[PDB]
Amino acid sequence: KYNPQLCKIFLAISDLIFFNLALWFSLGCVYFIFDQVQRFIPQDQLDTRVITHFILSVVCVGWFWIRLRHYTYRKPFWYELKEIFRTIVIFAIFDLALIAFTSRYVWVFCWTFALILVPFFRALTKHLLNKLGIWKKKTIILGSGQNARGAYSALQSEEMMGFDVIAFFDTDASDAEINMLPVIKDTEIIWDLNDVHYILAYEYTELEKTHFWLRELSKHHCRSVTVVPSVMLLRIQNNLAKRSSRFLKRTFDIVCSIMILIIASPLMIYLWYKVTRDGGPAIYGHQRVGRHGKLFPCYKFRSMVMFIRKTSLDELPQLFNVLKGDMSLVGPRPIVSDELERYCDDVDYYLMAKPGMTGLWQVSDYDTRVYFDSWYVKNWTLWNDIAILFKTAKVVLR
Amino acid sequence: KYNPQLCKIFLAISDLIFFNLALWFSLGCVYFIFDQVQRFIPQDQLDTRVITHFILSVVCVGWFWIRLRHYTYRKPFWYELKEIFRTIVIFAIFDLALIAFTSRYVWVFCWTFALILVPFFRALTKHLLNKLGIWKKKTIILGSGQNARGAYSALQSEEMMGFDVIAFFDTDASDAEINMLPVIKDTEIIWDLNDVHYILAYEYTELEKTHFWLRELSKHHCRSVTVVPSVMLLRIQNNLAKRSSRFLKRTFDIVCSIMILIIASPLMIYLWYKVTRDGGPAIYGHQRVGRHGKLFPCYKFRSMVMFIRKTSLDELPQLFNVLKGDMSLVGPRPIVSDELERYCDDVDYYLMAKPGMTGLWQVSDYDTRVYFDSWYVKNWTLWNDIAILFKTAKVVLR
Q: Nearest residue on chain B to A75, judged by CA atoms?
């Protein structure tokens, strides 16, 4: 039932309408709290101002349609969110330049509103549109090994893109069921299926096959093609080796930890009162390996004798720890010194960054955790920290 | 004697000074031809306007320093030049918008001046620094096969980059001289050399070695690293399959052919008068394979009985061909139908695009020409057309 043009039209309508609604909400709040905007913006400005905003609005959708191509190619939720935030803050810079060259409060209100609402309302409209069933588009995976099934699992890791993997294909598939999906070996089925999207996930040793398929989908002019690997210049950015990144992470850690301490102090104090009925220290320090291999006392709610565990509140006192600098909010899970050997050659990756209360594996065996922590350390960004923190809050809620 | 800090400082100073000098030149020309700018821009504007320009200027260098990194990483002259034009035209949108919310002639004059002068004067500055010996930085190549020597030759293809290859390295090198350069097999020489840049050019079958070297340059913290190959998403853009690109190429071809006709009509008419002394057609049509395999009469100056060839003027009448659509300026060299077989599986690539007066191989055996033409067809851009046309004019001059 997949329908691309209706999706694009609805998404553009949502973008324009809600981008205008941000400024209208700013106007309404200013009127409700101050009662006079003619005080602030005289009347003859309005139309002029608003039409300028209209122009900006269409420019925004233009930058999202013909340059960033949000309406023809699909990205995960978080990459979309980061790109949209960068675009909209750059647009806020544009409008600040326009206004300064001609109010701060109305500008801040409108654009904070926009940042909050445009992605959330895009999510709402795409969810309703998925409920309408023209969002999910049918896809065929090529490959019958671990790479294909892992990519399939990655696709189900976030349904909001709408890739419905309907069937697999591999001329030499050992099984008939991959992840309980039908397997196609005679390619005539594939070509008779032609709005069918394709995902190439052949393994490295079969990469040559992909090259053949790289030609195949070109011959019948199939534009919906995507390949996921198992004179070019790739710059691997070791972000954790930058002093500016470390200082920014320290500042963000301090601010967020202080804020959440302010938020959750009553609950922690109530837990203190309830636990201290036995007469002992409700908070204990356990030795763990931290940054550079440094041994630190992690502070935790006491769980044993001289409900919290199910709710996972026992990790709350670590914020005091974060107040001193031993760990961040986002990072590898703390482990004992005996568990260090299981990292093997990745030990250096485990010791390069401060540990975190939450990490990639917490929200996504021991080797899987080690690989996820190493990937987080190698590809650390502040955006990744925000995403992992939001996912951790989501997990806590569910 | 290589010096990065002096080069960066000089390049920034040149960029800023000449960006301001563009506006000063616009002011001077407007004054010389009009005699009154107070007519146009009153006096109290000047300082305000100029300081805004000053701000824009530093913004420009900022956008070239911390975002585009033109001062720490080296790019080919044409990629640099295209990126600089894109930056300047985006800034043109900026400044035209800034003026709109508050003259067309002065703005156009000033920033055509900037567009012409900033790249050319930056080139003059880096050539002067090359004469001063702080531009060429010493580089070590890794690899002893065809890929290493090919990357070496492609590096000498643009000496303005500033990469002086001083020695090779390969533990298993068969020879002692690669391109007559010294070869190292004990890496202790390389680590004793440590401002030494590195170029990894190991072949695909030895790619594993590069991975080891990928670690090696990491452990000694050598940040001057570069690799040239012999979940990622690579979108191969077949530009020639786009109707908009084809129409743009048609319009550009028409305009450029018309202007070349306007410029070169006296020379062509004179050569007509000189050749027609024998009483025959100075212009002849030779059958050649064109777009889609279409056979077309290519127009050429007559060279045989019933100086021009040395000067290569005999290819001038093909402009008339370009006027009808069988020829472009930039494209594969026209060949006879017997030469088609030598393209082999690449024949389809030879037939997809209109033949041009000049091509990539003309300015850069038969197989090399076929590969260059196929690469041009696959990776065609209007910027590539401009670069090849400029290189062809350069070749004609030399």
A: B233
